[PDB]
Amino acid sequence: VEPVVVIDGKGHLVGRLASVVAKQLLNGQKIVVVRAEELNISGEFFRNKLKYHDFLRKATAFNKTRGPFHFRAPSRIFYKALRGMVSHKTARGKAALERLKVFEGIPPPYDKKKRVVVPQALRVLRLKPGRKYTTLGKLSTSVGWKYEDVVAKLEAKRKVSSAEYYAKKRAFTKKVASANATAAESDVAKQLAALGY
Amino acid sequence: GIDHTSKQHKRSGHRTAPKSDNVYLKLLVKLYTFLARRTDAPFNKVVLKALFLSKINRPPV
Amino acid sequence: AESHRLYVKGKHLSYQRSKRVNNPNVSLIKIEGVATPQDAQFYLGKRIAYVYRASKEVRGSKIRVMWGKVTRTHGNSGVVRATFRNNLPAKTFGASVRIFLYPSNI
Amino acid sequence: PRKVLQLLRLTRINSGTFVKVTKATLELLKLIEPYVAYGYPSYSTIRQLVYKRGFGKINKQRVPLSDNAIIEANLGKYGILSIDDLIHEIITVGPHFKQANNFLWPFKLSNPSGGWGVPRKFKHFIQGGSFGNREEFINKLVKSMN
Amino acid sequence: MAHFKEYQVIGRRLPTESVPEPKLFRMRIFASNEVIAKSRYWYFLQKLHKVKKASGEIVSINQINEAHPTKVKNFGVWVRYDSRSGTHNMYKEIRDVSRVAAVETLYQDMAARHRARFRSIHILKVAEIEKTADVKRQYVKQFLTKDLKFPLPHRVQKSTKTFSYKRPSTFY
Amino acid sequence: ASLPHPKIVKKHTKKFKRHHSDRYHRVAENWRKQKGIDSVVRRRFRGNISQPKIGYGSNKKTKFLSPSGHKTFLVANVKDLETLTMHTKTYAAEIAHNISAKNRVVILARAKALGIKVTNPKGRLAL
RNA sequence: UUUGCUCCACACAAUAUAGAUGGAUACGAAUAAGGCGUCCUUGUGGCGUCGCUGAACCAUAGCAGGCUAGCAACGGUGCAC
RNA sequence: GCCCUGAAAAUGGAUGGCGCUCAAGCGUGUUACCUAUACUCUACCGUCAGGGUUGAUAUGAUGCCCUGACGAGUAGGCAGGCGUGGAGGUCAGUGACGAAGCCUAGACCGUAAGGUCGGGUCGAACGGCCUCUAGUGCAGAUCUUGGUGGUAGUAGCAAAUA
RNA sequence: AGAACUGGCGAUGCGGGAUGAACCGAACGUAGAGUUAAGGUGCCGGAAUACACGCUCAUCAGACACCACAAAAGGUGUUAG
RNA sequence: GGAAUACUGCCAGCUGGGACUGAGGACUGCGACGUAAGUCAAGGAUGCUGGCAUAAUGGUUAUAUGCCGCCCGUCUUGAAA
RNA sequence: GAAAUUGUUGAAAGGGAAGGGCAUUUGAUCAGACA
Ligand SMILES: [Mg+2]
Ligand SMILES: [Mg+2]
Ligand SMILES: [Mg+2]
Ligand SMILES: [Mg+2]
Ligand SMILES: [Mg+2]
Ligand SMILES: [Mg+2]
Ligand SMILES: [Mg+2]
Ligand SMILES: [Mg+2]
Ligand SMILES: [Mg+2]
Ligand SMILES: [Mg+2]
Ligand SMILES: [Mg+2]
Ligand SMILES: [Mg+2]
Ligand SMILES: [Mg+2]
Ligand SMILES: [Mg+2]
Ligand SMILES: [Mg+2]
Ligand SMILES: [Mg+2]
Ligand SMILES: [Mg+2]
Ligand SMILES: [Mg+2]
Ligand SMILES: [Mg+2]
Ligand SMILES: [Mg+2]
Ligand SMILES: [Mg+2]
Ligand SMILES: [Mg+2]
Ligand SMILES: [Mg+2]
Ligand SMILES: [Mg+2]
Ligand SMILES: [Mg+2]
Ligand SMILES: [Mg+2]
Ligand SMILES: [Mg+2]
Ligand SMILES: [Mg+2]
Ligand SMILES: [Mg+2]
Numbered sequence A: 001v002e003p004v005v006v007i008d009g010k011g012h013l014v015g016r017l018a019s020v021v022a023k024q025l026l027n028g029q030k031i032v033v034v035r036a037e038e039l040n041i042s043g044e045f046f047r048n049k050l051k052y053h054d055f056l057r058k059a060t061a062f063n064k065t066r067g068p069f070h071f072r073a074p075s076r077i078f079y080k081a082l083r084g085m086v087s088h089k090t091a092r093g094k095a096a097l098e099r100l101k102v103f104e105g106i107p108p109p110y111d112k113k114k115r116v117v118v119p120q121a122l123r124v125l126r127l128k129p130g131r132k133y134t135t136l137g138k139l140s141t142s143v144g145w146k147y148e149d150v151v152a153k154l155e156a157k158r159k160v161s162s163a164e165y166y167a168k169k170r171a172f173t174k175k176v177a178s179a180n181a182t183a184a185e186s187d188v189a190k191q192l193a194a195l196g197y
Numbered sequence B: 001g002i003d004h005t006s007k008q009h010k011r012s013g014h015r016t017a018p019k020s021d022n023v024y025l026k027l028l029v030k031l032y033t034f035l036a037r038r039t040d041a042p043f044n045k046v047v048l049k050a051l052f053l054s055k056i057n058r059p060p061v
Numbered sequence C: 001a002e003s004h005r006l007y008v009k010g011k012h013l014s015y016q017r018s019k020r021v022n023n024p025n026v027s028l029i030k031i032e033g034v035a036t037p038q039d040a041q042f043y044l045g046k047r048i049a050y051v052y053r054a055s056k057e058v059r060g061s062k063i064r065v066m067w068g069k070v071t072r073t074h075g076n077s078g079v080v081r082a083t084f085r086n087n088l089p090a091k092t093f094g095a096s097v098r099i100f101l102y103p104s105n106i
Numbered sequence D: 001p002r003k004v005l006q007l008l009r010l011t012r013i014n015s016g017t018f019v020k021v022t023k024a025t026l027e028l029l030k031l032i033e034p035y036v037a038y039g040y041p042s043y044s045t046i047r048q049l050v051y052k053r054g055f056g057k058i059n060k061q062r063v064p065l066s067d068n069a070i071i072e073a074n075l076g077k078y079g080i081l082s083i084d085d086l087i088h089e090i091i092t093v094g095p096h097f098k099q100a101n102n103f104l105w106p107f108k109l110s111n112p113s114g115g116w117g118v119p120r121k122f123k124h125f126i127q128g129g130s131f132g133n134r135e136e137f138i139n140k141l142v143k144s145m146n
Numbered sequence E: 001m002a003h004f005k006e007y008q009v010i011g012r013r014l015p016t017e018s019v020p021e022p023k024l025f026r027m028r029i030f031a032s033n034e035v036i037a038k039s040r041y042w043y044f045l046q047k048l049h050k051v052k053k054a055s056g057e058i059v060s061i062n063q064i065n066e067a068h069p070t071k072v073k074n075f076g077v078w079v080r081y082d083s084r085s086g087t088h089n090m091y092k093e094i095r096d097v098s099r100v101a102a103v104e105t106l107y108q109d110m111a112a113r114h115r116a117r118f119r120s121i122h123i124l125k126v127a128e129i130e131k132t133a134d135v136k137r138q139y140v141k142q143f144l145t146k147d148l149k150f151p152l153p154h155r156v157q158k159s160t161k162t163f164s165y166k167r168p169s170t171f172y
Numbered sequence F: 001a002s003l004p005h006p007k008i009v010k011k012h013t014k015k016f017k018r019h020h021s022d023r024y025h026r027v028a029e030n031w032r033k034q035k036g037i038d039s040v041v042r043r044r045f046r047g048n049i050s051q052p053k054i055g056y057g058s059n060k061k062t063k064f065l066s067p068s069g070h071k072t073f074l075v076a077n078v079k080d081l082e083t084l085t086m087h088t089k090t091y092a093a094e095i096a097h098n099i100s101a102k103n104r105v106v107i108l109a110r111a112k113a114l115g116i117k118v119t120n121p122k123g124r125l126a127l
Numbered sequence G: 001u002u003u004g005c006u007c008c009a010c011a012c013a014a015u016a017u018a019g020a021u022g023g024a025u026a027c028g029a030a031u032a033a034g035g036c037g038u039c040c041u042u043g044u045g046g047c048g049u050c051g052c053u054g055a056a057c058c059a060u061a062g063c064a065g066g067c068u069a070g071c072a073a074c075g076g077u078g079c080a081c
Numbered sequence H: 001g002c003c004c005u006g007a008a009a010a011u012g013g014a015u016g017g018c019g020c021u022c023a024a025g026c027g028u029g030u031u032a033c034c035u036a037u038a039c040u041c042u043a044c045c046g047u048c049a050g051g052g053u054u055g056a057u058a059u060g061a062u063g064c065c066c067u068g069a070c071g072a073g074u075a076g077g078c079a080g081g082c083g084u085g086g087a088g089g090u091c092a093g094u095g096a097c098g099a100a101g102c103c104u105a106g107a108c109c110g111u112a113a114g115g116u117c118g119g120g121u122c123g124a125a126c127g128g129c130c131u132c133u134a135g136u137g138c139a140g141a142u143c144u145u146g147g148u149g150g151u152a153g154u155a156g157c158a159a160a161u162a
Numbered sequence I: 001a002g003a004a005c006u007g008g009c010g011a012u013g014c015g016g017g018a019u020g021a022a023c024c025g026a027a028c029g030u031a032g033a034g035u036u037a038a039g040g041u042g043c044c045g046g047a048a049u050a051c052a053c054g055c056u057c058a059u060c061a062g063a064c065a066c067c068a069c070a071a072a073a074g075g076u077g078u079u080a081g
Numbered sequence J: 001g002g003a004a005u006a007c008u009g010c011c012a013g014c015u016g017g018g019a020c021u022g023a024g025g026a027c028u029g030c031g032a033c034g035u036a037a038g039u040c041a042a043g044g045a046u047g048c049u050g051g052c053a054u055a056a057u058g059g060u061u062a063u064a065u066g067c068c069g070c071c072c073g074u075c076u077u078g079a080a081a
Numbered sequence K: 001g002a003a004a005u006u007g008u009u010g011a012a013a014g015g016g017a018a019g020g021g022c023a024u025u026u027g028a029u030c031a032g033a034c035a
Helices: A014-026 A045-056 A074-083 A091-097 A136-142 A148-183 A187-194 B023-038 B042-050 C039-043 D002-007 D023-031 D043-053 D068-078 D083-091 D097-103 D135-145 E034-045 E099-114 E138-144 F078-084 F101-114
Strands: A004-008 A030-034 A040-042 A100-102 A133-135 C007-017 C022-031 C047-053 C063-074 C079-084 C096-100 D055-058 D061-064 E005-013 E024-031 E056-064 E073-082 E087-096 E121-129 F071-075 F091-095
Touching (some): A004 A014, A014 A030, A014 A040, A014 A074, A014 A091, A040 A136, A074 A100, A074 A136, A133 A136, A136 A148, B023 B042, C007 C047, C022 C063, C022 C096, C039 C063, C039 C079, C047 C079, D002 D023, D043 D083, D043 D135, D055 D068, D055 D097, D083 D097, E005 E034, E005 E099, E024 E034, E034 E056, E087 E099, E087 E138, E099 E121, F071 F078, F078 F091
Parallel strands (some): A004 A030, A030 A100, F071 F091
Antiparallel strands (some): A040 A133, C007 C022, C022 C079, C047 C063, D055 D061, E005 E024, E005 E056, E073 E087, E073 E121
């Protein structure tokens, strides 16, 4: 519906979120993913770390600069899983990937926008209670990501600014709701109540 | 997919017209073709079929 | 008012296809707001127009239209099958189409 | 099994033919059991098959049963003079069942409209497939294919 | 193998001149439809008496309906099944409202826990436990406690649209 | 101005070109049947060129018919042009390529009087 | 290298669209738990209320939206400072 | 029953890939849905079989017309057609007011073999139809003769004192 | 390596098994519509992130015939008897 | 003791929406509705209306996009090798 | 005065080949009837 959909990556499963996003891109929808360092993967930390080390040892024998590239950033990790679900070698596939943006945290162009969630890919709604899961931000640092502290420092600053905005908005909503309740019990309100509004 | 019980597009195996190019012989075939069609007499059908035979199949009498 | 829309928004998904063979004669159309094969029976027979722009002007206009109609439904998710006089180009996979309310049965 | 199918005039898939149940015909059905699905037809199934897909073999030609004149011209000597008399000789096996049944060209059915109802056809109906003796359940299958 | 119905099948040997009017044999069969029930009748009769379909006939087949379909009952079932090596006997208890709805639970449990298909399971007897404390399986006795009461934490709600505009809650 | 006919249907408008005629200059585009043992075109693999066959034959009602609805009959002078005086709704005269410029003027003038259509009336026309 | 280069407003020509057709409507955290309102001794506090989907909220009437008269409020909204 | 130990090979690595953990895994059950040159119905092409029709004054009885079914293919067989050099007959055929040849992401006819037309170049002979005849159709044979490329302005143009 | 019966490949495309002369479905004139086979319905990929009862957590899980392999012997891991 | 409903089956019961097709070309046949004359959905589509009359439809050609497509000839059970 | 091959002018496309089949978008070009 919206021209651009902004998805908050916190508390999502990497595989199920990527499948949802990949289908949206091929249908002409634009998707923006924020806070990629808060993504979740089912399974304990040691299992996913061992799998990544297996991926690390796959490279071209005669020249390491031609083989697979092992990106470490959480945004790039999600991009790799998403690119595997899209036929990126075709002109149609390249067009779909041009509609995708992945970020760590919430950069200033999208901090004052509305973020949505995908109930299909939510970890809390999918994994059975008591199961193990891995946070993508912690895993990336273990394999060579070097910007976990700066993201945390800037993200803490963003929450302070956003909390102040919410306090002002909450007060304004309280004032409007009080006026709306006062305006009730009138003839216009009764007529609207008869028609469901 | 059809499980044929016999050969397909098989010709009858009998002569329908004379092999020769004799104009007078073809006139007799045209005459007896009409008779064999509008007289239902077994003699006419026999004579019409016998006009198609080859030389070895028409020994002298 | 500020809205003059008399059609339902739609998207061109792809041609009718197998795993490795496609048929351009039939195009799959996704209609916004429909998620049930039963809800898609309303839009059967409705006219579909694909509107695009061109640099050259022919009949006093630089806008060209390809017409079509809805024939049947497709799958369990409300997708329908549409056929056009000329098949839609493959580059329009994901482009917006207009589904009008005529012929009307209301 | 191939020769028995030809003797029952089943040369293409989804073809049908009525068979009179005797001791000799039961042994034929056992041989071609994996390849056919058969059962016990009802009056409604027989009537709809003849009206919609009824074709006669007249002078080695497939002639649609569109009028009672052709039935009279080819089955008059056996006492049959109408399409319902032809149906009557089928539902009730009469003395002239062989001539009436052989007159009808083998039925050419399509695939069932609702499907076969099973993931794999080539298993016995008892085990969950398609072929075998499904008795009165054949009426539901034939109507879908007709 | 499908939704189950209970059929009473009564069979008999073909009468002869030496012994006219032979004995009648009856047995309850759980089957998807009428065709399977008659086939299963000959399968079990060939394991008990010198008779088969060719030399026998089916006298009558009737469907059995539950007298009280809407009353919760405790059922004890005895089964004989074949594993990958050898044959084993087994007794299990199922709590449900009807025999047909309790046999289907048994076939699901046998396939899930023992990998036993329909073809390798024999239903020896299905009986209803009438008195409490005759239940000897703890997974059934726990539902027989006076004033049973338990909540349903962590409710998950299905979503009809791809995107949601608020963080969901699992309250119930 | 010809006899009414049903709409003409072309089953295969595309030309049947010889395999690998675009790969080598020594191979002409005139159709030739592939007869190799391992030939993919002969074995009819998916994604290869289609071959001529009797199924592509055109309807006998509209066979040999030009888009205008007339049959093409070559003419060389006045005498053979007059053979179409009673069949102006079925045949259209066409002047042969080797007819001189001055003789084409005579043929065109004669055809106008008889009402016979000419498919190439602008050949060697000194305008 | 014949008054070139650059920013601004529109005058006219050409160019192309991976695809406007009312509005991308902003806390954070938890989920075997929370949002909002209210009171106090300001707490891991007391009480009330809400959820069970955005099926919402805002916006939306007039020649794709003209020309005029009057009434009640001193509001709502567009553009340039 | 499932899972784990038993369980060690060499370029980097493959449940087809991504990825999936009340599965998108394993056992089993019920529905809905997707799509083959297969099946049902219609049109058209061809083949085969069985039939109708000689009555002039309008043209093919090898003609016209009705009915039904059928169509995969190497080695190989038969049939109907297209094209080339030359020969007898015919069209009292085309032509220096331009024959033949060649060029032509120009047009038309045929399922195809091919035919015809427009435009350009060109300069002296050539074609349709019924028949006769053969040194009669090329993509290959490390084929024959002749001509031309990429390599490539590359290897190289450094013995014998200057 | 050598025999018996039948069906196939060779001589054969088409849908499926990613990929393959033989396996599964099914054999073919040129087109249109409908319904299916074998195999499938998270994304690549056309089709339910369908419904239902259980089991399994592997620091080398498992994932579909031909077919691209694993055993004897063990575990107070867990489930049922 | 008296009903209802589920499940399965039948109707030569009625009725709404969508898609593809229009083959044939004087009459002849089998029927239906009518006292009749006639009519009809009965051996294959007609009636009404609009715009344009040209590159607008369409053809050819170049390019772009989706899916598919391994190098021919030959010997061979088997050749893209 | 043909083809292989080559120069100039004009048009077009080009991210480790090019060429091909089905369908359509775009550019250029073209025949047919106006009864
Ligand atoms: Mg592509
Ligand atoms: Mg580094
Ligand atoms: Mg369907
Ligand atoms: Mg199946
Ligand atoms: Mg052509
Ligand atoms: Mg071969
Ligand atoms: Mg399952
Ligand atoms: Mg088909
Ligand atoms: Mg065929
Ligand atoms: Mg053939
Ligand atoms: Mg050229
Ligand atoms: Mg010349
Ligand atoms: Mg000279
Ligand atoms: Mg020679
Ligand atoms: Mg040569
Ligand atoms: Mg050769
Ligand atoms: Mg050579
Ligand atoms: Mg040489
Ligand atoms: Mg040098
Ligand atoms: Mg040197
Ligand atoms: Mg061989
Ligand atoms: Mg495999
Ligand atoms: Mg899909
Ligand atoms: Mg066009
Ligand atoms: Mg292409
Ligand atoms: Mg490919
Ligand atoms: Mg060898
Ligand atoms: Mg080879
Ligand atoms: Mg040249």
